[PDB]
Amino acid sequence: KKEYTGITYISGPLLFVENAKDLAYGAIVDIKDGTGRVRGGQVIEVSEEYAVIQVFEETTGLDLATTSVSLVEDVARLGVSKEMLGRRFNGIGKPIDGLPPITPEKRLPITGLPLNPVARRKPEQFIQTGISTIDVMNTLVRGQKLPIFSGSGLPANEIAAQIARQATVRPDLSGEGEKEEPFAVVFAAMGITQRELSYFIQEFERTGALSRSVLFLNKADDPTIERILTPRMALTVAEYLAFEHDYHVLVILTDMTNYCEALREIGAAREEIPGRRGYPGYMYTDLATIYERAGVVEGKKGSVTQIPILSMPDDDRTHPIPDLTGYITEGQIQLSRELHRKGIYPPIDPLPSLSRLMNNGVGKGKTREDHKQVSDQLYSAYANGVDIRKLVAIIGEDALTENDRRYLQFADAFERFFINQGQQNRSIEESLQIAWALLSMLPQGELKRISKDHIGKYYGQKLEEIWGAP
Template identity: 50%
Template sequence: MSLEYIGLKGIRGPIIFLEGSDGIGYEDVVEIRLENNELRHGRVIEITGDIVAVEVFEGTDGMMLKDVHTKFLGHPLKMGLSKEVLGRTFNGVGHPIDGLGPIFSNQRLDLNGEAINPVSRKYPKNFIETGISAIDTLTTLIRGQKLPIFTSTGLTHNELAVEIVKHAKIAEKEHEKFCIVFAAMGVKHDVAQYFKSQFEQAHVMDRVSMFINTASEPIVERILAPRAALTTAEYLAFYEDYHVLVIMTDMTSYCEALREFSSSKGEIPGRKGYPGYMYSDLSSLYERAGMIEGKIGSVTQIPILTMPNNDMTHPIPDLTGYITEGQIVLDPELKQRNIFPPINVLPSLSRLMKDGIGKDFTRHDHGIVSDQLLAAYAKYKEVTSLSQVIGEDELSDNDQSFLLFGKLFEQHFLNQGETSRRLGESLDLGWDLLSILPPEQLTRLSKEQISTYLHKDKALLRFNLLENNQIERILGKN
């Protein structure tokens, strides 16, 4: 049953207040008709006694207290869905903006989603191949996982997101249905156009559903955009049996909108002005990733967030780290050296990786090469710090070999440009890089593994090191 009221009690920012209302539910959809017959939309965000606060999607500009007709429709905001959402572009509220007409839906779902019973969750194990060596080999993305990318202003996170969309796949299982839901929040118009043009040029738009909220559009849409995207992903996963990868950028823009919205409601601010419930709010988004017993599909999330001042202790990355299962960290220093993608593998982590790699999932040697690569790169960082104090010429032969390894690792393994690599290629490249180190320094490998996987002559040839006069001494080949 719909209820209609005339007049308002107050207006504050994008929020209107009504008094004396009854029988209204939280999150109910509202139609607001102005004196000039203009129709706007909103949703109930707070009920205190008989005072109802309504968030107006289109804003409250030109709205007066009198002669405003408010109609409560008696249900939460829903979105019509079908497989036709693939290849389409929507705004933050889920309305098509690509000029291709409405979606002919066979299902309408609540944008807020439905809580997944923890008992019904399946533990994520199978992996998703992104084509990025640093991710696939060292911070493997597992199907059903939520793995954020921590970046900062000026880094190439948009380009990285595009590469993942273009090359991500369910490894070695082409018969399984795989698609991507991409949500951009608070982006500039040229960035929105960049995403769309890149997907079209790569001919992957037919497996992508895009949700675009630009910086000039209402913050209300920015708050709803990830919810619309995740509702679409849940439909494709749990009704159409797709494995869905959801990429959301930029979660910092979302949290800024949340802070502005909280301030307009007059709420007491928390740390750095963000609302005290931001942890719960982010959880309501991130926890919509996962797999359900009895369902074929899955929802995997890669939220991208820009760390203010590159500070990982800022509330946004701090809270995100508590909720999610790891992080991929982009490094400004690597970006300055023209390395793409500029992933700093040492602070990066995938907590579910150990259960989704190995013989039955990726390749039997995945775990050991990953461990040894990280250990060797950490040693390279130590040697680099030492060389800045005493100079490279004073380093021991072993330290010189790690210095060489680190430089080659960054230039050949991390730096891959727009080229996609299969997981097998990345693992083979990792073994070749380890082959240039003295065997006694490979403390994570057994003698049998060293003799099986390391091929020094092949590595020297691959990295064009045979003509280097120092190589014989550094590698101990006397």
């Protein structure tokens, strides 16, 4: 209701307003110009002399004679409800699908509180993503943080959409049927363009995956403070759904490099000295406040799982953004440019990929008895095959021993069948079947990492069952 009209300075994104000591730090304001158009802003400095407001959007029509500022909310909040499944929002909570706005049950601050370290429990259940190179060798456990590392031209958006469309939980394996629990996907896309926006909307709506999803979409021409606020609302909704309705939610943050760049620009706008390589000194803490909101909590049935996606700047893992992500998260999944250029999709390279909670989520009564040893054997056999392939170009294929040719043929068949799956939605049984059929090319007794009981139970199948099924 009250409006302050003591504007004394306008330059770039900042404006100063005098006699405004009633505005709390971090508040949200409305800025009305002479023509009546209303913009938005955020208070970044409060003093006895004046308050400093960082303005969303541009400051074209503003002038000192007629501009006014009024308060909206002391602390930024978001109204949440279970009606939000199936809706789309713009990154500050405004719907963009043309439907009426939701009526909230509660309004929660977007900067959530940390979890008590004694309240957590160990993650011990897996998620079937439908991709063989992830389910078998780099398994995703409920409560993990597993980033995907990609590059400039690699198809990270396609893999993100495929995982969001195909992901599910498998309660029949865990408890012989157990009881069916709800599943939801929270999708946050930050700094995307129009082509990717159309692609995401079409992919989510063409197959009915929208009925269990919430989308927070932020375009590249949107204000940068919306980009800062975008993942926090997604995590607020995810935590609300998981710890107040016992949902199993999966959160996908589509590009963290855009978040880091927006953080750098916002920090430089507030006149702060940067840290290493021009990025802010508080970057580790700011990224930790986002990643560490996942996990599973003792006494609750729900869980939150995160899959951040980031693009390495020049295929450099010593860049600060991929370097600090390795200190907080549990492993990574790496895309390969060679596999992508050879025509293989999804181009996941198994050698540098790793999951650090795999052993707690597989095994007896969780996936199957033979999971771990099969994954180890596949890793070792592929590692041998690639070096043999490099040696063949010098010494020739006739100078090889008998088993080396078998390893080379295994490497070719592995890349052709296990990794390159296209748009198939393979269950874990199908992935293990293909993996066991691939290991049967190698002679029995060369499989050192697998015990003889599993070999007797599962060895000997032929790969023609998928050779004739592309």
